[PDB]
Structure formats: structure tokens, C-alpha cells
Amino acid sequence: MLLEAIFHEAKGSYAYPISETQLRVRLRAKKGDVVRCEVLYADRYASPEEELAHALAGKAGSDERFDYFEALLECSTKRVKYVFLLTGPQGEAVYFGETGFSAERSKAGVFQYAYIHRSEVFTTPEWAKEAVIYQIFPERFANGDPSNDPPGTEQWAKDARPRHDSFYGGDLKGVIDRLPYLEELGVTALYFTPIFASPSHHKYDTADYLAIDPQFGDLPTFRRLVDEAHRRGIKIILDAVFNHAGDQFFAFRDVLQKGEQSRYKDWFFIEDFPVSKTSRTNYETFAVQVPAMPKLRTENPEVKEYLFDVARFWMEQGIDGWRLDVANEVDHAFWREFRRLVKSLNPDALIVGEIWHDASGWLMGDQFDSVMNYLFRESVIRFFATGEIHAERFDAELTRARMLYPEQAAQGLWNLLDSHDTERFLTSCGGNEAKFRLAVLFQMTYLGTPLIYYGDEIGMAGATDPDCLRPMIWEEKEQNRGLFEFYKELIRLRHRLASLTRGNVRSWHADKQANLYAFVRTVQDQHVGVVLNNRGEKQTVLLQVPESGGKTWLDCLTGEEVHGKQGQLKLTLRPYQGMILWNGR
Amino acid sequence: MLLEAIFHEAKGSYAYPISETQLRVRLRAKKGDVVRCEVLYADRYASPEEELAHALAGKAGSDERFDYFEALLECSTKRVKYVFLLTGPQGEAVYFGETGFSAERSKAGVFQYAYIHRSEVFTTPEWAKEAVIYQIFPERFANGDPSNDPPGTEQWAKDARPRHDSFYGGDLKGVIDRLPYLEELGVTALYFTPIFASPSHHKYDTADYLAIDPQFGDLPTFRRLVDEAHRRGIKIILDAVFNHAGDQFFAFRDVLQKGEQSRYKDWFFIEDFPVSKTSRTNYETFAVQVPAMPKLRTENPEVKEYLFDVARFWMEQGIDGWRLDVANEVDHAFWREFRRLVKSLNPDALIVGEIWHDASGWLMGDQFDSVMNYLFRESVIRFFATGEIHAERFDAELTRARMLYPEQAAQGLWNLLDSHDTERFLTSCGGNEAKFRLAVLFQMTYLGTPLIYYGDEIGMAGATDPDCLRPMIWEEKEQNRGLFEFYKELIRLRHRLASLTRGNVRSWHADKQANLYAFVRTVQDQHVGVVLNNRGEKQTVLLQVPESGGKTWLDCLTGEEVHGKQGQLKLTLRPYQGMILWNGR
Ligand SMILES: [Ca+2]
Ligand SMILES: [Ca+2]
């Protein structure tokens, strides 16, 4: 075995508590090097001669190059020291501890998790653990009030092909009028892109953090929406841009006018004075040279307090959470204090960040609850849409991503297929609904929070921005009601099957040849096996099913009953068919 | 190469800034598996066409199983994305990025360090970067005030052999009287074990955090000590026990008296009332079943605030830092807020924790400045004292430890040889002064902060506690003045050679056969090579010395001038001799 490829650390994603007296521990090793992983542990102050407790670390998964083992240590003292005992293919017994590797336990030393503080157990909102989020781009969802429509508002038709500066009149009143549609779909939360006052079409350059943009509505209307949504079992999540403000931001306008004498000059990153000019910027902004988006100095206590007051104000309106853009460019102290503030005002308020790279630094439990799962989207696009990867690669990509963060974060990552900045997933599938449906079936049964992009549920298509921002199809005749019913059915199932929302994930089958992938979601005694035949061909597969997990299953989508024979389960799937097998527990 | 053994993460000790625009990056690989490591990077928003910057990652060291490469990325935008270009012995190359490994750069993906905030740049006190700390166990240092002696105090003699319940009358007045001695020695800070009021002899069970224990002195005397030490260029560091209090602590006595009616019941961890029992106790304590040491609930805002007021009180008396006991059992938020408070009152105040295992979670820059370097002591014990490890092993242990944390932490770790809880180093060396001196020579020239245990400088000896707690030897005729002058000279040298306090460290030579180890400290153009002949026999060795680093050196200990011939340096060292060669730069 390659000892240099074995990894563990007593913190982060490899050692973390799931409760005050339970510590989850993970170990990584070159694929195939470790056949058995056991943990020997005890209280940190325990006598040397004392018998050590034992915990077997089952193989939680495997990616392209590594195997992952996971164990749970029961630590009534809330203090624990531990060493790993690894057995290789040849029965070699290797101990692994903080000191290193050795054939002798005492020489391997022990990893230590000094203390488990209840305040350090990663905790996320309970409602968020079984949610189905719906992303609404206000300008294009529903025009409920034509009196606030901006000049140039185009016709709201299905054949409408939006331009970069098009206007259709979508607003908050429109969302309220369409709540019965959303309730029928079964969504439990609405995620809105920026709706705060801004002079641009995208509103990522905030002019007033304390006002709804006039073209969308006013405060009285927002309140109505919050209340009407809540009485429908639908929460509201607002997108906040705290990394930078717009050039119309009161503080920035003051600096543009007074400059050196501006009381807010230190709220931004200004190189020289005058603070700006036409086509030229001497201050730090979002990305590169974006004058309309001056970066906010969140490290400045005054800036931090101002934004915290902004958060306070909107939460007072009854919102249920925040989605943060460019979160990775705001400091960690700001995020740690933001969480403290938000959770104190409402422990059920969700905090989601947008970070396009490993976000472990923000997912330890003291900052965000979760982030956008862009890895999930990439894997699903390549497997279901473009066919760039096969079932085994798909399996490896999902597993690797799953092991990135502590389970509390992974369980609530927002699993999106597309967004306001990408082409529609149906379009990624080249219009193939069969492929589209299999990806949705997977989305609704996989680990994480499903996120639906407005219109996808009724068959809307489109290229990336701005063609992905086409007017929502409200004409039932123009809607793909068959797909709508498909979404509805999957959502109902996810809510009834505890394992789909709170279960763990384990790969069941992965065949690169047949391109068939299966996994099992498990919660307590309940097992739900999802079988995906991602191939334009009717195929048969023989899955392993030990009697311990059951001998009979029910396909929740067809009502077909299947039985196992001698630890094997024979299944026949039609082109791109997906099965959701419930073990009756 | 073995890709599974290659590691890097864009955080912690593998990716961290040293300035607002400079990111240090480190990568490990199986030793000898990678010959060249290059970093290709650019601003995270750079166009896919712009050329990438190049950074060559030199080999910063290697331990038992790994090679460590280190590079510095110049990031003027404070945002960076980067990929590694690795080359093996036989010229094969591969890109390593967040996505993974690939022969194609694009497929390897890219690691990203989202943003570098100035407030997140690990910063430690400038004075502590070149300090020499002296550990004083007050009860046994100097009895300057006989009038405050505890009942039953024993005579102060060299042949005295301390018992667990002994008393010699050491106090703060004594320390003041002996400041001339400490100034002569050249120490720049004094570290005191607990001195707060407590009924026990060890004082780890605090009765009053706001008062000096009557047997040691009082506030006026402590203020005098602080002022007299400062005018002699000596700082004062106090030991704080915030994890638990003593049973005499006012809050705990209130609980013992009022029980469930006590307003401080939640300041502790109790299971039921009343609180007590024989050999038994119904409340969480330090270690196991230690009645006099009830754990404090630092997570409780009242407890945290009370402890913060304690810190404010002593810093108001002028102290220069804190040494924290059982710091790993106090929560992280407490330490982050503690650092904020402490640094706001005195930016130069030092925070040192005592953690007997990987302390990376506390050494990111938002909590502690440093910790006790027990690894340094273990390595020095086994190499210089017991002879259990040879020169190559010694080298590996030092290197592995060095790569554990960011450089700002490593540069300030407290490198001790012994303490009030261990046998004296002289005794570990079986009374051999030659071995002892070579260890001190190493201590005084290695990376980290030298920590002297009281009396070691004058040749005191003894078994572990309480034999390591003998009364300080003051009678000059009974002190080892030769050793004293040796310490003094090494200390002067450390202050005159910038590379010994602010330089990096690189292994120069390691001969397991001759048991000879050499390393070089470097700062700017200055090079200081230390050669240790850790064997009881005169030996000759040929060290490699490229003309670039110089061809002439001076042994700062003897004044001997050495010359290199054709990139080689021939040296003949006497038994247990150590040389400190300065390149004259
Ligand atoms: Ca409208
Ligand atoms: Ca005394």
C-alpha cells in the first residue's frame, strides 16, 4: 500500500462532530490499498493500560483515485484520541496516527479531537433539509402590475426571443398571483435574484439596499408576497450582493462628490482622487474595471455594521434566508458575524453562498449553511446531456464532490441544472426530453437540495443569457404539462421518502459499458434504490441485494413490484428509464 | 510519478498570504517522486488568452516520506488562480489543479485563492520574532520576601529535594531582586506559571483571577515587577487557565451554597444537585474526577465576558502576553474574540497556547500567535539526550514539524528543552554537559523562540516533577558559570545574526553514520550554517558549498576562519562540538 496516499486530519471534512458526543471521522487512501479500516479510540485522559473502544470504518465511497472510509466515534466525555488500524490486500496490519505509520500501535501515535463544543456542531435549518427551491428571475416570471412596467416593455409571448436590454414587465405582484401554480408544483422556497433598487437591468449594482426596485414593486407588496407565500408553505430567500455596491450607492455617490472630504472614503478601495472619471476607474471593483460596481470594504466596521442593518431590515420583513453572490471575496470574520446575527434573529434562516471552487473554508459550520453545487451541474450535464462521461466517471465525480465537506453541508448543497447565467438544461440535452427527465429524476432523488430554474418544469428551452431569460409560459396549451406532472410526482415522492431528503448516499452499480448507474439512499431501516438506465437502449441488469436490506421492492413511479433472488435483483429498463425502488421500510 | 501521494489545498498551511499581494503555496509529494515543481498563475478574472505568470517552487525540505516544494505568488490584484506543473525524474510532466491531474493544463483545472484580505494576513508581534524566553516557576526562583512565606516553608539549599507539598517561599519580590541576573543573561521575556490566588501549591485551580496569590505578592508588587522588567528590556507573560476554575472560585462557591438557585449554575457543567461526593462529583472538571477544577462554560456569554474582563485587568497592569493552559478545550469563537480583544488593547501582546497535538486549527492567524513546540523537545531529547534517533531521523522530524503550520507560526514556536512537568534536560542527557551544550547550541540557532527553564543556564539537574522544581541555585560558587557564559554568548550571537531570528531554515548535511547534522539559516544575503557533531569522537566531514553562497566563513564561537575548496568545505569537529559559520553577509 502507498502510505503517502493515505490521508486524515483531525478537523475540517475528515474529523467533525455530528452531535455533542459523536465524532464522524473519514480517511482517504489509494483505491484498493486498504481493504479494512478500523478505529481504536478512548477519552484523551484515559489510562494507557485501558482497553480502547472499537469502531469499524466502512467504505463510504470511491472516486477516480481513492477509497474513502468513514466511522463514528461515540465519545461520552466529548474528548477523544484515536488511531487507525489499516489492513491491506495481503493482510498487512498497519497503524496510522498523528505520529505516522507503524506496525506497532504505540509508535503510530494518536490523532486527537481535543473537545466537542455543542456550539461547534454544524447545524442547519430543519426545513432546509427537505426543501425544493424554485429560482425566480422577477423580470421574466409574471407581470402582475402593468403600471410599473418600464418603457419599451415587449410582448409576453412564447415565440419571444429576449435581447440583452429587453423588458417584459415581470414584478412581485406577478409572483403573488402565480403562487397557486407554485404551490401546486410543490416548491417549498423561492429564490429571487436581486430585487433591490438599481438602475441596471441585472441589479447587481445596488443603488439602495433598503428598497425594492420600483419596476418590481414596493415594500407593502413584498410583505404581501412574504405572507401569502408563507401561508402556502413557501419560504422566501433573497439574493444579497455584499461584496460590492452599485455606483449609485449613497455612500459612493458621496465619495464621488466630496472625495478626500467624503466621510465614506474608507468604505471602498480608492487608489487616488478624483475617485473616478469617464471610461476610467481608480477604485477596486467587482471583476476588472467595472465602474458601476465599486468593491465594499467589509473589513471596515462601519461598512459591516451598515450591511448588518440591511440584513436586519429585510429579516424584519419575514424573509427566510439569503443567497450571497461573490461570497468568497468578502472576509471570513464578516461571514462568521453575519451568521451569528442572522441565526440570532431567526435560527431557521438559511445562508447560501456562491463560490466556484472548493468552499470548505466557508463550510465548517461557522459561516454558510451551504453553497451552489456547481460540481453537481457539471457532472449531470456531462453524463445526461452531452454524454461526455460514462457511468463510472459520473460515479467518481459525485463521490469526490460528496467527500469535500462535512455531511451537514453536503446534505443541503443547492443542486441546480442551470441558471440565469447558463443555457437551459433541456437545451444542453439538445431538446431530448427523455435525457432531460432522467437528469431530473436523479436531481430529485440525489443528496442535496433540488433547485428548479423557472420554466424548466413546463419544458422551456433556451441558450445562455439572454435567451435563458425568456418570458415564462403561462398558456397551458404551450406548457409541457406531462413534464409538469413528472416534476410534481417526483416532488411528492421526495417529501414522503425520508431517505431521499435525510438519507446518506452509497453507489450501488456503475457500468461504463451499459452506462447504467445506481445508488442507494438510506435512513434508519429505509432503503431507496435509484436505478438509472442512461442509454437509448432497453437493458437488463443484475444488482446485488443481500437479504439484510430486504428481498422485495416497489418502484414508486410505476407501482411495479420486484423481488430479489439469492442476493440478486434482476431489472429490465427501457431507454433512459429511471427506477425508484422502495424497500417498504 | 505517484499522483495519489501528491497534495495541496488552497488554504491552511499549504496556501496562505504573507502580505496583501503575496501568496505562499506549498506542495508535498512522495520523496524523490517529483524533481521540478512550477506554478502557473494569474488573476482569477484573467482572460483565457492572457499569458500565465510563472513561479518556480523550490524544494523547501523533505522528511521521512515526503518532499515539500514552496513558491511565492505575486498577486497585485489580491485574487489568484493557479495550476501546478510537475516534472518527474524521467522528465514526464503533469498538471495538477483543483480538477485533478492531467497531461493537458485545461483538464487539470485550477486552484483558487479567492481574495487576500489584509486583516487575514497572519501577523505576530515584532519583538517576539527575536525573543529569548525564560520560564519562571515563582515558588522556586527567588524568595525576596520572607514575610509572605507559606506555613511550613523549608530551607533554601542546593541539596534540597522537593516534595509535592513542599514550599520554599519563592515570590515576585525575589524576581525583582534578581532582574539584574536575568538582564545579564540576556533574556527578553519572562513566562510565569499561574500566579493568581489559589489554595493549592500548583495554583492551576484558581480561586481569584483578579489577585496575585498572597504567597507570591500583591498588585503593587506585580506592577513594580512589570515596570522594573520593562526598563531592563524584559517583557512579562502570564499563564492563564481559562478552561477551568478552582472550587474556591466565587461563582462555584455560590453554586455549592445556593445549588439550583445559584445565578452562576450555568457557568459550569453540572448534571444534578447538590454538587459533590466522595471520590465522586456530579460536574465536569479538568481531566477526570478533579473536584477542585470545575470546567468553565466559556460558551456562556457571561463566562466569556467575565474572563475577558480578567484579561483587560491584567493587560491594564502592563503585561505583554498570555500563555494558555488546556487551550484546546476552550471553544474557537472564544479564542478568536480573545485575540481581537487582546490585540485591540496591545497589538504587541503575544498569545501562546499549550496543545499537545496538531494545532493548525488554532494557528491560522485568527487565534493564537504560537504554541509550545513539544515536537522540538521530543526531537532534541531523542537525538541529543537519549541517542534513540540518528542525524537523518532528527532531520526528518524537524522538517515534518516545520511544515505543519504557516511560517508566521513556525517562526515563533516556543522551543523548550524541558519544563516544570518534566525531568531537566541535563538529567535526560544523563548528566553529560557536552551533550547538553550541543542541544543548547542547536536551540539558540534553530527556527523558533528559545525557551529557557529556570536554572538550566547554571547547570541545575533533576528528575521530573517535583524533582525538576528544586530551589534556584544562587550561590555563585555552586553555579556552573562556564555554562552561564555559554548561554550568554549564544544569546548575544542570536541577536547579532538576523538569520538566526528572522531567517528560514534548510537542511545542509545529515550523516546517520557519523551522526552529524548541519543546517543553514538564511535572511537576504546572510547565511549562517550550524554544524553539530553529535558523537563522542573527533570526526571529519565534507559539506557541499556552492560559490554563490560564499567561499569563506567565520566560526562565531571561536573566531576560526574556514575556506571552501572547489565548492566543498572540509571540517574536523571535536567530540560534541558545534560550529556556527557566518558567511560574513
Ligand atoms: Ca409590471
Ligand atoms: Ca516569600
PDB file of C-alpha atoms and ligand atoms in Angstrom, chain B residues 143-150 168-171 215, ligand 2:
ATOM      1  CA  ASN B 143      12.484  34.326  47.942  1.00  0.00           C
ATOM      2  CA  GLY B 144      12.818  38.088  48.178  1.00  0.00           C
ATOM      3  CA  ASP B 145      10.145  38.474  50.832  1.00  0.00           C
ATOM      4  CA  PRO B 146      10.381  36.020  53.765  1.00  0.00           C
ATOM      5  CA  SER B 147       7.358  37.686  55.389  1.00  0.00           C
ATOM      6  CA  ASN B 148       4.888  36.193  52.909  1.00  0.00           C
ATOM      7  CA  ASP B 149       6.175  32.627  53.161  1.00  0.00           C
ATOM      8  CA  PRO B 150       3.571  29.855  53.355  1.00  0.00           C
ATOM      9  CA  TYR B 168      10.469  27.302  49.632  1.00  0.00           C
ATOM     10  CA  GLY B 169       8.971  30.787  49.651  1.00  0.00           C
ATOM     11  CA  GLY B 170       9.756  31.899  46.112  1.00  0.00           C
ATOM     12  CA  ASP B 171       7.975  35.138  45.216  1.00  0.00           C
ATOM     13  CA  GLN B 215       2.361  33.999  48.955  1.00  0.00           C
TER      14      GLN B 215
HETATM   15 CA    CA C   2       8.443  34.574  50.165  1.00  0.00          CA
END
